[PDB]
Design an enzyme around this catalytic site. Structure first.
Site, PDB file in Angstrom:
ATOM      1  N   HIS A 155     -83.107 -65.552  40.638  1.00 23.20           N
ATOM      2  CA  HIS A 155     -82.336 -65.987  39.481  1.00 23.20           C
ATOM      3  C   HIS A 155     -80.888 -66.045  39.871  1.00 23.20           C
ATOM      4  O   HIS A 155     -80.496 -65.516  40.949  1.00 23.20           O
ATOM      5  CB  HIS A 155     -82.486 -65.010  38.286  1.00 23.20           C
ATOM      6  N   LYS A 159     -77.532 -62.886  36.266  1.00 24.52           N
ATOM      7  CA  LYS A 159     -78.640 -62.124  35.673  1.00 24.52           C
ATOM      8  C   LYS A 159     -78.411 -60.639  35.950  1.00 24.52           C
ATOM      9  O   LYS A 159     -78.212 -60.257  37.109  1.00 24.52           O
ATOM     10  CB  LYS A 159     -80.005 -62.565  36.198  1.00 24.52           C
TER      11      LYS A 159
END
Ligand SMILES: [Cl-]
Ligand SMILES: [Cl-]
Ligand SMILES: [Cl-]
Ligand SMILES: [Cl-]
Ligand code: NA
Ligand code: NA
Ligand code: NA
Ligand code: NA
Ligand code: NA
Ligand code: NA
Lengths: 267, 265, 265, 267
Positions: A155, A159
């Site tokens: 990600h 994140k």
């Protein structure tokens, strides 16, 4: 045969994706486009961002939109959706809710609503992810012995939580497939002398950087072979596609609370 | 209680891997190690190449081995394997055959009347399970996903795409009552135009000593789902052979493949 | 004109791969195949396991082999290798050492005063070249790219991340005058917050019999660039050993590593 | 120290990405936003699509925008860019041209313009791709013997040409690194009995489906090992980032025709 659909948060990135999806779907027409009261964008054509004059003006009149639409697709904010919920009930609208961050009373409110209207609520509206869970469940039973199970997830740089909820859901699905729970067998990152890998361990790796939307891989690593099942999300566009399949499922339903397992016939 | 297993072609590359798998399996015991009359290894401990002593000396004595073993796992050559089959027929041995392939398949299906045997060209748990994963995935992604099959093999592989990739295609095609002959596109190049949503497109990568990678890509709007199998070496067939032996432990007679072994059909 | 090459530990797994590489190399000839006094293979043709006859019989005769060969490639054990070194010192053999590792490194750098030798723990062309690719990439992507190093190894690997991944990190860190101790994050888990743009994050995957994959990801806004090395087996070191022998053909004496061999430093 | 930047095609998808990039860059300010004459969007705030009132209204007045801006970034259409070019020259604007589909006379027109103004023109404004070409060049010399070179490329369901131009450029870069040309050694797709692979062959595979933006992999497949160099494009956003590095390079330059090799110091 054509679904009369309204989109909530019509100026938002998600609302815009939902609008382009409705316009493109051969069996749907866009009939309403809502934005918050006081939005600078009120009055603009819903399709002005794309090439198109849809003749549907962005409005904050929830009542009129619910009166004119048969479906409302809503990926906005929990308190916004609850305002929409009340209109949806009074106007008998079929509702697809992609919003997240509800409390338990609020979720139970959505279920209760399901006694009067037909609705779909799901944390993940993706066809891909939902099918992948079922794939993982079958793979985990077939590969129950002789395969070391690793979950690798990537990600973007912002994140804050590792591993992702999706990775954790994947781990739980895999653990449950052999009557286990994750917190008995999960290992999160590895550094230092970690020793011989226990064959029951589920190992998680969380990669972070750039603007990666979300890649998830389950690796079944065996002696002389590997089997990988990977889901790559390029953008929220895939949620728009699953939202339309949700609307098509709801077309046949009078009332009821449904999720994507119902929509996809997975349950 | 542990399976009493003999291995054929025991000093060869595949035989060695089989011996390794039998010793490592906690429910199997090596009781026989068979090799060719012309082998320079006869008399040596089957485990010497591992620095282990097994009590089992490499022999060419097919009769004694079959008399002494309950199972024989054989990945050799058709001629030697058919000689092995007759001895298995006489000694009621459970046979696991990784040899490929010969006309000859008829004789070993016919052997299933009298003994229990497994025959498969692809004895990998991973490939067989992947085949069933594709069947489910093809049905679930029947609408909205462009299906691409990407396969990589070594510089000496003469045919493209691989037979495995083709089986994947056929399984996928069949999952919606279709034929691959209707929808296959192999190695596109030039102006190909708008991809038809029904097309199954094949890509074949060739180079190095790649043993065999196979990926099925389901390419959708905003997302992709990939199901990939990677073979590192024939060691995976040795693992499958042991599962075949375990399956055979329960069976009296019959011809079986890996589908039966893994409970998939 | 072809290199006259001897191989140590010739009936072992690595020795066999080396023999294969020497026969396949069109500029090398096998002239010696050395094995332990305790080997059960002495006297056999070095190529028999390949169904080839080379004219070279496996022997324990270190002296004769070194007298007859111009090169000796040795991936065995420190004790046997140091015995091999003294014989190389007496016969002016060009030595290629894939053994690892011992305190002992001092003696074989000291041997470089009198004979030509190559020593490296990682004799792969691919890994050494990749190291220099990372150096260039780290400088070019010094701004705007989050750097992540992802490495996968087998179920028995005790340390994380791998030493190779660490070397990649250090090379990357150094390309902008930095230290890994300043920026490394190993195996993140829990609430980790906003990623610092300077961080080099390490992920270590463990399972099966994975020989070793190493990926450096440069993750940027809208794009990613990945530089990946995949090792299938020790056969790649056999290829590197042959390049080492080729390099040594030009050299009289000296201690060298793969950097010198490939012209990289 | 802050670059006064105007963006062309401000209502287009690319223009919008360029606007968000300018706004976010700490060393740039958005001072102009152009759209075609007669555009429905004229008069709207440039940042209305995002959350922000930039105070910059979309206009078709090319003259005023070029007067007020020091830089114009233009990813639109060849005839549109040529209209912008003339204003850029009269107003001494530094120009970043990401538009494609020029003829040779038009390209030569851009070079000629470089005698009077500073400009960047490139078919690929991506930092990633440009650096990857140089990586490939070094890898192709180091792996000149013993490695089979395969180029694997994936794009969306609407790409009509196989392999992609980027893949072809990659192949040419690799071939040239050993004094070869591509059409001597290129093999495009494989079907049937293709036989023993020739060690000099460069093999191309073109994967097609979904909305894949563009993945490119060069595989150096050796005996016992593989080396892969892969570029993944998630979106045109990466071009916006390279366009800003182009603007920063142009800040130091009075006149001259430049490409991304100049901008990145690669040449
Ligand atoms: Cl672990
Ligand atoms: Cl045999
Ligand atoms: Cl030795
Ligand atoms: Cl070819
Ligand atoms: Na429509
Ligand atoms: Na055992
Ligand atoms: Na199908
Ligand atoms: Na040779
Ligand atoms: Na650095
Ligand atoms: Na700014």
């Amino acid at each position: 045969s054509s679904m009369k659909i309204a989109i909530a948060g019509a100026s938002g990135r998600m609302g815009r994706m939902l609008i382009e999806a409705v316009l493109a779907a051969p069996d749907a027409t866009l009939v309403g486009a809502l934005d918050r009261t006081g939005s600078p964008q009120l009055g603009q054509d819903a399709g002005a961002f794309l090439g198109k004059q849809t003749g549907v003006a962005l409005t904050d009149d929830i009542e009129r939109v619910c009166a004119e639409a048969d479906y409302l697709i809503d990926f906005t904010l929990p308190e916004g959706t609850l305002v929409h919920l009340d209109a949806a009930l009074r106007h008998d609208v079929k509702l697809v809710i992609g919003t997240t961050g509800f409390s338990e009373p609020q979720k139970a409110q959505l279920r209760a609503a399901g006694e009067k209207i037909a609705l779909v609520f799901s944390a993940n509206m993706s066809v891909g992810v939902n099918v992948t869970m079922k794939l993982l469940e079958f793979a985990a039973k077939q590969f129950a012995q002789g395969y070391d199970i690793e979950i690798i997830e990537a990600h973007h740089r912002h994140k804050v939580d590792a591993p992702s909820g999706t990775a954790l859901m994947m781990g739980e699905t895999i653990a449950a497939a052999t009557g286990r729970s994750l917190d008995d067998c999960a290992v999160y990152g590895r550094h230092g002398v970690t020793g011989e890998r226990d064959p029951s361990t589920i190992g998680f790796s969380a990669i972070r950087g750039g603007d990666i939307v979300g890649d998830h891989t389950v690796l079944f690593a065996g002696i002389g072979e590997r089997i990988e099942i990977t889901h790559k999300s390029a953008s929220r566009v895939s949620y728009a596609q699953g939202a339309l399949r949700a609307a098509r499922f709801l077309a046949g339903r009078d009332a009821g609370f449904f999720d994507m397992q119902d929509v996809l016939g997975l349950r």
